[PDB]
Ligand binder design. Structure first.
Ligand code: HEM
Ligand code: HEM
Lengths: 136, 135
């Protein structure tokens, strides 16, 4: 997500934080109306329903911030690459060539599983870096 | 990824390091054979090719470890949910209900964009938690 997209989420969150008791009552009423079977799982103090819903929303937003922070190293790397003249379209050939090289060095003990893991790691990283390229 | 999968990555990585000079040479030779148009992007220094490929592989693996650590909070949360009696099948209805509540509360200021953002955030989180449930 973009810094502004995270900003939009945090604002909507602070909007609800104001009316937390109301939001809490609405959530559980709704959840137990549509899915009455999960009622017994919730052993919360009845006066804290608002607080407990707020804690869920808090958790999501705070964790979203932490993950965004964790992604910043990759965006940093991608910005240096923008400066090197690398473009989004160049990432596949590098990945294939990395994989080609590994498979050749690792030799006999190279597995389809290993190749899948290296591929997943590369594509996931390249996806975040590519997003950064498109911001430029 | 599981810890065991990350270790598999780490182990193959250490193997390449063992002959990093050769891996470097192989890599750049292949890249420029396959895609000569990108050759002008790279600084000319054949003797450093081992080091240069190593920076790349090191970055990938360490960053992979960093991201995996960043996911541990969601996984810890999910482990508590397992103890609470929660099942992977419960995640979609709770997500729908959470976003339904936000939409009702925010009222006229709600937008499709906001709804799509909360959806993306919830689904990405739930996907990590559900993976933990299935272990
Ligand atoms: C991404 C989704 C979810 C998030 C972020 C979330 C967050 C939280 C948080 C922060 C708590 C407070 C206790 C703790 O930290 O362990 C909690 C408790 C709880 N949640 Fe969730 N939750 C999620 C999904 C679900 C789902 C799908 C269910 C299914 C019914 C559920 C049921 C419960 C129950 C039963 C408790 C404990 C209530 C009690 O204290 O008795 N949660 N959740
Ligand atoms: C996920 C994929 C990639 C990773 C992890 C990666 C990693 C790195 C690292 C760690 C460096 C050292 C300098 C620095 O840290 O900024 C570097 C440099 C560099 N990379 Fe990448 N890179 C990736 C993709 C690419 C692609 C697609 C290209 C396209 C041609 C490329 C071309 C370059 C160039 C030209 C340099 C400057 C060093 C030199 O001139 O040899 N990289 N890369």
């Amino acid at each position: 997500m973009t810094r502004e997209e995270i900003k939009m989420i945090q604002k909507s969150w602070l909007r609800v934080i104001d009316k937390m008791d109301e939001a809490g009552l609405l959530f559980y009423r709704r959840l137990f109306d549509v899915e009455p079977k999960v009622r017994p799982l919730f052993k919360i103090d009845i006066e804290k329903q608002g607080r407990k819903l707020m804690d869920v929303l808090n958790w999501i937003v705070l964790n979203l911030q932490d993950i965004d922070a964790a992604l910043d190293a990759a965006r940093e790397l991608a910005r240096r690459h923008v400066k090197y003249g690398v473009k989004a379209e160049h990432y596949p050939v590098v990945g294939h060539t990395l994989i080609w090289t590994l498979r050749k060095m690792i030799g006999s003990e190279w597995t389809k599983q290993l190749e899948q893991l290296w591929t997943q790691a590369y594509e996931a990283l390249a996806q975040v870096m590519i997003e950064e390229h498109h911001h430029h």
